[PDB]
From a paper:
Among these variants, Omicron, with a dramatically increased infectivity and enhanced transmissibility, is rapidly replacing the Delta variant and is poised to become a predominately prevalent strain in more than 110 countries since it was first reported in South Africa at the end of 2021.2 As a newly characterized VOC, Omicron was classified as the fifth VOC by the World Health Organization (WHO), with over 50 amino acid mutations, 37 of which are located in the spike (S) protein. The top 3 most potent NAbs (XGv051, XGv264, and XGv286) against Omicron sublineages were selected for immunogenic and structural analysis, which is instructive for structure-based broad-spectrum vaccine design. To delineate the structural basis for broad neutralization mediated by these NAbs, we determined the structures of a prefusion stabilized Omicron S trimer in complex with the Fab fragments of the three NAbs by cryo-electron microscopy (cryo-EM). We obtained cryo-EM reconstructions of these complexes at 3.0–3.8 Å and performed local refinement to further improve the densities around the binding interface between RBD and antibodies, enabling reliable analysis of the mode of interaction.
Numbering used by the authors:
A (entry chain E): 330 to 530
B (entry chain L): 1 to 104
C (entry chain H): 2 to 121
């Protein structure tokens, strides 16, 4: 009957509290059948724009191991994640390369993430002295200096704490609402490919 | 502290013209230029946050652009209350600069 | 959030001027507060900023030490002493919160608060 086994996209998508933007939890996924049909439905997940491979061909030309990331970002920064646009959150927190396979998944989370008291546990970076290459993380929290003089110490003028916060009160409209972007990455490294979709009958 | 320069103040245009107000700095700052509309005898008001990002509560006839040192504001179509003066603010480093200029 | 401030002050030279503005409505003592001059024949000008929670002060060029700025977070009032007045140094004065970065709980409010005074 060719009965199969699964690997947790239920942990990837239906987790309780996601990670922050500056330290996004990269998860490697191997040795599966990859049921993307749950991912394919446009009713739970509003945005499924794909760049490397088509959504129709996702159950073919299958890959070695896939990389699942995570985000909680505002609705005005979802378009920014995709390659070709540089801004303030895909330039210093998550740089995507010009040609890559795999694609973003964005859905609203006003019920699960927006708290009336507040949600100051999401942090991001908008000052960095250097820039980003594709696909690294910057967990370190040294104080950014905007001037020639060594400012240092507490956060004064031209000292900046580089980890700034979101504000997720539910009074805000569409545009500042948490859109939990999960971006997949597909790679074809020289190895026996073992993440490949369910053919069944 | 770096200074900024704009276009000379002699801009005069009718209703329905393309506007190309320039604003240039002397050091490669990312996007931190703001623009402020000032009417005579009145407090200022923001129009756009920083480069393309636009302030809530205003009509969408305003746009801004620029990534290096050259910075532009563009009006899509003019309005009867367009008669004002527009200022650039540097942000980023703290000693700052107010770039001046008017449009009649 | 609104800013109120006092009326017209001494014009005759040789004296020093106290001008103060108070943040009325949602008293926030973390964001940077700035002073802006405007002449009838000249554009806007920046002189100095104040952090009310820390008390650090940064000034403009060529008149560091002429400007003294005092902050009190308890009464939500910010004071401004400027000495050595000229006849050509007259301007209408504004106080503003044009920098959206809070130093207390790491928040960066994007709008820039649109904070401006009435103008005296």
């Amino acid at each position: 009957p060719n009965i199969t086994n699964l690997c947790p996209f239920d942990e990837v998508f239906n987790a309780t509290r996601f990670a922050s933007v500056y330290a996004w939890n990269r998860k490697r996924i191997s040795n599966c059948v990859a049921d993307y049909s749950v991912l394919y439905n446009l009713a739970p997940f509003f945005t499924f724009k794909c760049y490397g491979v088509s959504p129709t061909k996702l159950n073919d030309l299958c890959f070695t191991n896939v990389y699942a990331d995570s985000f909680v970002i505002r609705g005005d920064e979802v378009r920014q994640i995709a390659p070709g646009q540089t801004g303030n959150i895909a330039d210093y927190n998550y740089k995507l390369p010009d040609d890559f396979t795999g694609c973003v998944i964005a859905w609203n989370s006003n019920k699960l993430d927006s708290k009336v008291s507040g949600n100051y546990n999401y942090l991001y970076r908008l000052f960095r002295k250097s820039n980003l290459k594709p696909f690294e993380r910057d967990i370190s929290t040294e104080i950014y200096q905007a001037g020639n003089k060594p400012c240092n110490g507490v956060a004064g003028f031209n000292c900046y704490f580089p980890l700034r916060s979101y504000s997720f009160r539910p009074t805000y409209g569409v545009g500042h609402q948490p859109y939990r972007v999960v971006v997949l990455s597909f790679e074809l490294l020289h190895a026996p490919a073992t993440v490949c979709g369910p053919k069944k009958s | 502290d770096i200074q900024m320069t704009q276009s000379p103040s002699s801009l005069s245009a009718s209703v329905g013209d393309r506007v190309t107000i320039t604003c240039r700095a002397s050091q490669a700052i990312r996007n931190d230029l703001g623009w402020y509309q000032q009417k005579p005898g009145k407090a200022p008001k923001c129009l756009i946050y920083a480069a393309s990002s636009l302030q809530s509560g205003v009509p969408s006839r305003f746009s801004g652009s620029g990534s290096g040192t050259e910075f532009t504001l563009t009006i899509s179509s003019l309005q009867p209350e367009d008669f004002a003066t527009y200022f650039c603010l540097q942000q980023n480093i703290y000693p700052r600069t107010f770039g001046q200029g008017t449009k009649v | 959030v609104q800013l109120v401030q006092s009326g017209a002050e001494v014009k005759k030279p040789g004296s020093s001027v106290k001008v103060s503005c108070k943040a009325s409505g949602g008293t926030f003592s973390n964001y940077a507060l700035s002073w802006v001059r405007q002449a009838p024949g000249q554009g806007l000008e920046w002189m100095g900023g104040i952090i009310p929670i820390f008390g650090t002060t940064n000034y403009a060029q060529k008149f560091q030490g002429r400007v003294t700025i005092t902050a009190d977070e308890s009464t939500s009032t910010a004071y401004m002493e400027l000495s050595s007045l000229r006849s050509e140094d007259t301007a209408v004065y504004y106080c503003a919160r044009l920098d959206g970065y809070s130093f207390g709980h790491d928040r960066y409010y994007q709008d820039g608060m649109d904070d401006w005074g009435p103008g005296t």
